[PDB]
Amino acid sequence: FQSMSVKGRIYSILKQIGSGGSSKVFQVLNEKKQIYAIKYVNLEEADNQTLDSYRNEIAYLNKLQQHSDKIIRLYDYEITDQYIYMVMECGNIDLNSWLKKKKSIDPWERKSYWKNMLEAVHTIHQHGIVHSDLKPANFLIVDGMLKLIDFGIANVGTVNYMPPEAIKDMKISPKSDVWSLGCILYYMTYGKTPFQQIINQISKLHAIIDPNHEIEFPDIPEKDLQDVLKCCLKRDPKQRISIPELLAHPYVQIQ
Ligand SMILES: O=C(Nc1cc(-c2ccncc2)c[nH]c1=O)c1ccc(N2CCCCC2)cc1
């Protein structure tokens, strides 16, 4: 019977979701048996840059809560020199586990999910945050609504969602998140990411950078959706569509 106290409130552990990185995620219940998700971070072996990365992520998460409901609720938090305890809202499943399980993907639910992501990523952009590591795992379904859980600020990993400008910078702008968001919608449309096919990562990273490598957009009934994908997957960030432009796109506005 494991428990935890956060700002003088007792939470009984229902079960553990995530682990590793010195961070554990738990489904918990308060005194009134209400569900919440608690993120625990151990700071015992964490360096100054890491601590400040964790302090920056919490500050933004807490500020940005008032600006969108597509951003995970942070109810409370405890921060000492030894740990972080984050009392957040509980979701049913993250988008990665959801997409992996689902065979069919309803065009209406795909559209609703797209709108949700755009609003969340748009909010963070307005406060000068560029995630730069967006993947389905960064989104949580919380009662048929997608919510952004991470801001890329704090510390198996895919390379399929990486923008060409991220590789070239060896340059990151809001446009980098548009590429990654485009890969999520490409996956929700074609059941794969634009460069999933390539096994050799050195060849895969070269393909994303190479403009001669043609991204395949098989014809679909939703002509609008196919345009969104072609606009997001433009290799030149200057020629790539912006998030305010995507919110004005027929695919999000016309039903
Ligand atoms: O990540 C999950 N949840 C939560 C994560 C966070 C969170 C916030 C900030 N930084 C990290 C995590 C907040 N609030 C949650 O609720 C999750 C739940 C169930 C699940 N699965 C069940 C079905 C089979 C498949 C597995 C899968 C995932």
Q: Looking at residue 67, which CATH number applies to its domain?
A: 3.30.200.20
Is 97's C-beta closer than 6 angstroms to any atom of ligand 1?
A: yes
| Phi, psi angles (nearest 5°) of residue 13 | -75, 120
Same-domain pairing of 166 and 228: yes
Return d(Cα 173, Cα 167) in angstroms, integer: 13
Same-domain pairing of 131 and 253: yes
Same-domain pairing of 40 and 105: no
The arrangement of strands across the sheet holding 139-141 comes to 93-94, 139-141, 146-148
Residue 155 is part of which domain span? Answer: 93-255
Same-domain pairing of 148 and 188: yes
Same-domain pairing of 84 and 134: no
Q: What radius of gyration, in Å, describes the C-alpha atoms of the chain?
A: 19
Resolution of this structure in Å: 2.5
CA atoms within 13 A of residue 254's CA, in its CB half-sphere = 7
- Pocket probe for ligand 1: among 60, 94, 133, the residue whose CB has the most ligand atoms within 8 Å is 94
Method: X-ray
Return d(Cα 24, Cα 14) in angstroms, integer: 13
List 74's β-bridge partners, or say none. 88
Is 140's C-beta closer than 6 angstroms to any atom of ligand 1?
A: yes
Return d(Cα 99, Cα 157) in angstroms, integer: 16
Nearest atom (ligand 1) to Cα of 18: 1
Q: Are 229 and 217 in contact (CB under 8 A)?
A: yes
Same-domain pairing of 208 and 223: yes
Domain end among 92, 123, 150? 92
Domain end among 28, 57, 92? 92
> How many domains are contained in the chain?
2
Return d(Cα 38, Cα 107) in angstroms, integer: 33
Burial of 195 (0-12, 13-18, 19+ CB in 10 A): buried
The protein residue whose alpha carbon is closest to atom 7 in ligand 1 is: 149
Domain end among 92, 109, 127? 92
DSSP 170-204: ----HHHHHHHHHHHHHHHHHSS-TTTT---HHHH
